[PDB]
PDB file of C-alpha atoms in Angstrom:
ATOM      1  CA  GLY A 682      81.617  32.607 153.848  1.00 46.24           C
ATOM      2  CA  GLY A 683      79.415  30.928 151.021  1.00 43.17           C
ATOM      3  CA  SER A 684      78.570  30.946 147.373  1.00 47.23           C
ATOM      4  CA  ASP A 685      76.470  33.926 147.331  1.00 52.69           C
ATOM      5  CA  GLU A 686      77.659  35.372 150.757  1.00 51.67           C
ATOM      6  CA  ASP A 687      81.114  36.069 148.898  1.00 50.22           C
ATOM      7  CA  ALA A 688      79.554  37.372 145.567  1.00 51.98           C
ATOM      8  CA  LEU A 689      77.868  40.227 147.664  1.00 51.38           C
ATOM      9  CA  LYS A 690      81.619  41.377 148.741  1.00 49.61           C
ATOM     10  CA  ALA A 691      82.785  41.698 145.430  1.00 50.60           C
ATOM     11  CA  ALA A 692      79.812  44.205 144.698  1.00 55.51           C
ATOM     12  CA  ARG A 693      76.863  44.713 146.317  1.00 55.23           C
ATOM     13  CA  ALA A 694      75.536  47.748 144.684  1.00 58.23           C
ATOM     14  CA  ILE A 695      74.533  47.241 140.922  1.00 57.83           C
ATOM     15  CA  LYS A 696      76.872  50.638 139.962  1.00 58.08           C
ATOM     16  CA  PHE A 697      80.215  48.744 138.973  1.00 59.43           C
ATOM     17  CA  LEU A 698      83.398  50.885 138.269  1.00 59.47           C
ATOM     18  CA  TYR A 699      86.210  49.280 135.985  1.00 57.73           C
ATOM     19  CA  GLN A 700      89.818  49.825 137.587  1.00 57.97           C
ATOM     20  CA  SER A 701      93.295  48.586 136.620  1.00 59.89           C
ATOM     21  CA  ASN A 702      95.039  45.467 137.547  1.00 61.09           C
ATOM     22  CA  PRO A 703      98.947  46.451 138.012  1.00 63.81           C
ATOM     23  CA  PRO A 704     101.210  44.042 139.438  1.00 65.88           C
ATOM     24  CA  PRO A 705     102.275  43.106 143.073  1.00 63.52           C
ATOM     25  CA  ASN A 706     104.217  46.055 145.094  1.00 64.93           C
ATOM     26  CA  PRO A 707     104.439  45.106 148.537  1.00 64.45           C
ATOM     27  CA  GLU A 708     108.060  46.901 148.940  1.00 65.52           C
ATOM     28  CA  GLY A 709     108.183  49.284 145.990  1.00 67.37           C
ATOM     29  CA  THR A 710     109.361  46.390 143.552  1.00 64.25           C
ATOM     30  CA  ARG A 711     109.498  42.755 144.260  1.00 62.68           C
ATOM     31  CA  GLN A 712     109.559  39.545 141.933  1.00 63.12           C
ATOM     32  CA  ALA A 713     108.383  36.326 143.318  1.00 63.10           C
ATOM     33  CA  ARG A 714     109.177  33.544 141.149  1.00 63.58           C
ATOM     34  CA  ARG A 715     110.885  30.132 141.223  1.00 66.06           C
ATOM     35  CA  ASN A 716     114.621  30.123 140.694  1.00 64.95           C
ATOM     36  CA  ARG A 717     117.651  27.889 141.355  1.00 66.00           C
ATOM     37  CA  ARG A 718     121.304  28.717 141.208  1.00 65.97           C
ATOM     38  CA  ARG A 719     123.279  26.330 139.369  1.00 68.80           C
ATOM     39  CA  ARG A 720     126.951  25.151 139.932  1.00 70.84           C
ATOM     40  CA  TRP A 721     129.862  23.916 138.157  1.00 66.57           C
ATOM     41  CA  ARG A 722     133.149  21.685 138.630  1.00 65.89           C
ATOM     42  CA  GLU A 723     135.654  23.000 137.071  1.00 65.60           C
ATOM     43  CA  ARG A 724     138.829  25.726 138.231  1.00 68.27           C
ATOM     44  CA  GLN A 725     141.640  26.976 136.532  1.00 72.14           C
ATOM     45  CA  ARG A 726     145.209  25.549 137.846  1.00 68.13           C
ATOM     46  CA  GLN A 727     148.378  27.638 137.418  1.00 66.66           C
ATOM     47  CA  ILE A 728     151.889  27.481 138.828  1.00 64.76           C
ATOM     48  CA  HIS A 729     154.409  30.083 139.912  1.00 63.42           C
ATOM     49  CA  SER A 730     157.538  28.891 138.476  1.00 60.49           C
ATOM     50  CA  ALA A 731     159.552  31.725 137.637  1.00 57.76           C
ATOM     51  CA  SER A 732     163.302  30.125 138.578  1.00 55.84           C
ATOM     52  CA  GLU A 733     166.655  31.493 137.119  1.00 57.83           C
ATOM     53  CA  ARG A 734     168.445  29.256 134.784  1.00 56.19           C
ATOM     54  CA  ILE A 735     171.782  30.495 133.398  1.00 58.94           C
ATOM     55  CA  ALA A 736     174.024  29.066 130.404  1.00 55.91           C
ATOM     56  CA  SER A 737     176.667  27.364 132.452  1.00 55.60           C
ATOM     57  CA  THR A 738     178.898  26.406 128.948  1.00 57.44           C
ATOM     58  CA  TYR A 739     182.157  26.113 130.827  1.00 57.51           C
ATOM     59  CA  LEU A 740     182.831  24.637 134.117  1.00 58.32           C
TER      60      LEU A 740
END
């Protein structure tokens, strides 16, 4: 509205009251912050080699 028009909105009467200034909570408890999900390039490589080898001593 203006430099003074806006100020009037904040307080029109000399009588001012002190109120608290808690954090935002549109849906109970939400945290709006900048974050990025990082990743990696490495996986585990196993092998299922459970063969069966006997001791063929003689023919």
